[PDB]
Design a protein around this ligand. Sequence first.
Ligand SMILES: [F-]
Ligand SMILES: [F-]
Lengths: 442, 443
Amino acid sequence: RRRQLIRQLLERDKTPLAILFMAAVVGTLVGLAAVAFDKGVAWLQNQRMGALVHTADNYPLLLTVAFLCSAVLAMFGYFLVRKYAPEAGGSGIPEIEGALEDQRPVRWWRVLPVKFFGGLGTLGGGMVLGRQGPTVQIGGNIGRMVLDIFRLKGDEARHTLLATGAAAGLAAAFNAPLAGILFIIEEMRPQFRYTLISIKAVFIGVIMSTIMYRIFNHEVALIDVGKLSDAPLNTLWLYLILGIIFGIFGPIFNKWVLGMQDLLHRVHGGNITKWVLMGGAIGGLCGLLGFVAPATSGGGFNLIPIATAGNFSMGMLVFIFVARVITTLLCFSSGAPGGIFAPMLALGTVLGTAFGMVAVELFPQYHLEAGTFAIAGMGALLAASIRAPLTGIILVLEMTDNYQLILPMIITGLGATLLAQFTGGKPLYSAILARTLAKQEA
Amino acid sequence: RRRQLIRQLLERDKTPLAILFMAAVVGTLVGLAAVAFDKGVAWLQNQRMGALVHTADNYPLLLTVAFLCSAVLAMFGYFLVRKYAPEAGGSGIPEIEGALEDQRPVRWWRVLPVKFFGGLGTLGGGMVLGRQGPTVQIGGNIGRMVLDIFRLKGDEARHTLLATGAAAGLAAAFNAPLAGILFIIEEMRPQFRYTLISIKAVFIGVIMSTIMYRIFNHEVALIDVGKLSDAPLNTLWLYLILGIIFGIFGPIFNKWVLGMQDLLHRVHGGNITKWVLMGGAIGGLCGLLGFVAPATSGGGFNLIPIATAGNFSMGMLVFIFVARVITTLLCFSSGAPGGIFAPMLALGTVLGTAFGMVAVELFPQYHLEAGTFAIAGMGALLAASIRAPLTGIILVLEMTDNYQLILPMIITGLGATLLAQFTGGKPLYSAILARTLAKQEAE
Ligand SMILES: [F-]
Ligand SMILES: [F-]
């Protein structure tokens, strides 16, 4: 195979022009789609806050339209999923993973309007779920769509424009172009065989997407954390320890999401009506919690700068981790449309902060800031539950811009995956795809 | 088929603990090796400088020992390669790339000391080459050496340990642990078929490597550029134009490194004596230029902060660029052990700043800084010639810490790789491994 190689080496990186141009198209649409989905979620969260002000006196009436406003949107989102596109429940990453394996269909006529409007309901309602769920799957189907529309033929094109859409979708959600590209090549691509996915092409999609988001979202950071302190070599070993903690929690978390998926399935049994009702119940619980204890509900990006800054009592930090574990599980394991990535960032930040607190008091010789540990911890549940450490590290880097912590971030991340592996844990997206492929054969 | 996948998913990322623990030892060994190598180079660089201090009056005598301290050192380096390990000539990425394809052998009993001491010579003498050549090859061979020594069996172990060692050697040379990991996935790993290279394992070797380097090199950064201004969205099209200029130039530079490779192989016909003698001629030239005009010689890192801060005239930039296109082909295409990555960093920084300066006077409305174009340009030649735009971008990011420039950096990089393809350029490292496999089965 020496002579085939010399042929291949000289032919390397010669992506078909058509694929390259189409990637620019896909990028752009995913960009605009993501921007719309973002403006939508914001508007409903806003109207929802304009409702509570209309009734800011009568506390029981006030706690009621908090519940109902979320309940309605929740149901409407659960319903669109159950009736028109069942594959648009949950994250959307296992599904787009399925499609890259050629084992799940990209029904873009149904999922685009379902995921987009159904998610617009669950997120805008204020449930604990992340945009990246919807934007990735949306982005994937938008990729499929321009395939079909322009009748592009070939395996390269199908796998590429699908990959490009997913990457443009992740990027746009976090203003993170590197995190999107890396996610394709670490996690999304088919893991057990070769593929012809042009990286240059995914790159182009991601650029356009990110430029679109930049047209409508300039001048304000998703997460602003300022420039934290450094980490001296004699301080690293503490980050290893923090990883090991994430490493034994990762798998335990994964079990709960899968377990709660089953346990919640008994409540409705598959029945579109009990399910949708259970949706507005979960939705309302979130909209309510979004009033009476906002850090237990919602996306969670708000409490990240706070936790990093040290402005939470250890008691509030313990409260937020428990309450958020409970509501992250309730929302994602229930089947609503929306990702689980982003709420893992809050969960990670909080646990990390909490660690740094204890680290600060036990070791004043180290001159610690608990916020260096929050930031190492932010991408760590991504590391131990999703087993995509290279993506969580680069994503966190892009969002927090604290490069001086790269070594502690890399160490916590690796510590988390190693102990996730070793204690019999599996990548969450892979164990969700698997369950779904398995039942498709049952 | 489907039931196979379902079986594979539930088993994903279970890297054998033996491979994991062994990656740790590879990263550690390549770390120390890289540190030692780098202390090596700097020591000799320093000696050469004190020798010019001893004779700091007699200008022609002074010019002489400059040429001579480097000429000898160079020759020692060309010699060690030609005599004991010819696969240690040049970069050392094409070689290790081939090895991962199982199409080149990893003679670690030979290449470790050759490349180390051969590198010490060419770099120490002040030639236009980079530690990343030596360190990636040294690192792969180290990863091969423990494999053998611990008798590790399997394809996955041979591929992984060979890979983590190469990432660790790139990480180490640059203090760029991400760029290390990314280079393996974007370039070094076999490009045209599946492989069983554990990312978590390469990661572990990169950590240990990088930590070793930090044990000995903390408190200083290789390039310090400060925090530069941001880039308005109405300013981005300038970065696409730059990437286009890098994209037409990439292939042309590639043609020259390949052509000059040939044209120098005439001078000595392959003969160890004429070759070593040409080696000390070029090496002597660089030790000479290393005094009368230091910007035209050496690794090139020293002039990047100067260029980025706009402290060069436009003339001085045109000179430096041309002067370095000359001394880069001469140093690298001559066969001397040493990477071409880093001298491209210095080339891209200079072209960037040049374009930047034009942009400033043409568009005062944009409030531009030439340094922002220097940064987008720094990794663009990497993108255009080597065709690893992801690795280039993340390398410059990790070395400049100007994250607000990510869009401009990605745009120039893509503008570069795109135009390189459209003008029929090829991945330079893949063009070299290709050249080398062809003269193999040429009987
Ligand atoms: F998700
Ligand atoms: F090189």
